[PDB]
A paper describes a structure:
The deubiquitinase [name] in complex with SPATA2 is recruited to receptor signaling complexes by the [name] ligase LUBAC and regulates Met1- and Lys63-linked polyubiquitin and receptor signaling outcomes. Upstream of its C-terminal catalytic domain, [name] harbors three cytoskeleton-associated protein glycine-rich ([name]-Gly1/2/3) domains, which are ∼70-aa SRC homology 3 (SH3)-fold protein interaction domains known to bind to microtubules (Yan et al., 2015). Here, we report that the [name]-Gly2 and [name]-[name] of [name] are novel UBDs and demonstrate that [name]-[name] is indispensable for full [name] catalytic activity in vitro and for [name]-regulated NOD2 signaling in cells. [name]-Gly domains comprise a five-strand β sheet topology and show similarities to SH3 domains; a subset of SH3 domains binds Ub (Stamenova et al., 2007).
A detailed understanding of how [name] [name]-Gly domains bind Ub came from two crystal structures of the [name]-[name] domain bound to Ub determined at 1.7 and 1.9 Å resolution. To obtain crystals, we slightly extended the [name]-Gly domains C-terminally; crystal form 1 (aa 467–552, 1.7 Å) crystallized in the tetragonal space group P41212 and crystal form 2 (aa 467–565, 1.9 Å) crystallized in the orthorhombic space group P212121. Also, the Ub binding mode between the two structures is highly similar, with hydrophobic [name]-[name] residues Leu475 and Val487 engaging the Ile44 patch of Ub. In addition, hydrogen bonds are formed between [name]-[name] Arg488 and Glu507 with Ub Glu51 and Arg42, respectively. Chemical shift perturbation mapping of [name]-[name] bound to 3-fold molar excess of Ub revealed a comparable Ub interface in solution studies as compared to the crystal structures. Residues from [name]-[name] that engage with Ub are conserved among [name] orthologs, whereas Val551 is less well conserved. Mutation of Leu475 to either Pro (as in non-Ub binding [name]-Gly1) but also Arg (representative of [name]-Gly2 and most other [name]-Gly domains) abrogated Ub binding without significantly perturbing the structure of the [name]-Gly domain. Importantly, [name]-[name] L475P was still able to bind to the NEMO ZnF domain. Hence, while our data reveal [name] [name]-Gly2 and [name]-[name] to be novel UBDs, they interact with the Ub Ile44 patch distinctly, through either a central Leu475 ([name]-[name]) or through a central Phe288 ([name]-Gly2). Additionally, Ub-binding interfaces in either domain do not overlap with known binding sites for tubulin ([name]-Gly2) or NEMO ([name]-[name]), and the interactions may co-exist or potentially even cooperate.
Numbering used by the authors: 467 to 479, 482 to 552
């Protein structure tokens, strides 16, 4: 959504911020998910696994899986203009 890819800085509007580490469609779902690596550990978060299956690897308790169509480029950085 909006040309998000792995490595993109994303936002899921209290907005959450994470870097997309994985995009795909787990078995059982009919929608594409983004697996986000968040900056800090979070309660309902894994180390890159979703419903038991591993999709990427990150530090303990930093992986959050959401619907890709719920993601937007991280607005904190979207307005950043370059040097001249």
């Amino acid at each position: 959504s909006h040309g998000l890819e792995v490595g993109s800085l994303a936002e899921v509007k209290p907005p959450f911020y994470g870097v997309i580490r994985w995009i795909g469609q787990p078995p059982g779902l009919n929608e594409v998910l983004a697996g986000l690596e968040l900056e800090d550990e979070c309660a309902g978060c894994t180390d890159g696994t979703f419903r038991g299956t591993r999709y990427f690897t990150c530090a303990l308790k930093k992986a959050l899986f959401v619907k890709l169509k719920s993601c937007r480029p991280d607005s904190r950085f979207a307005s950043l203009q370059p040097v001249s």
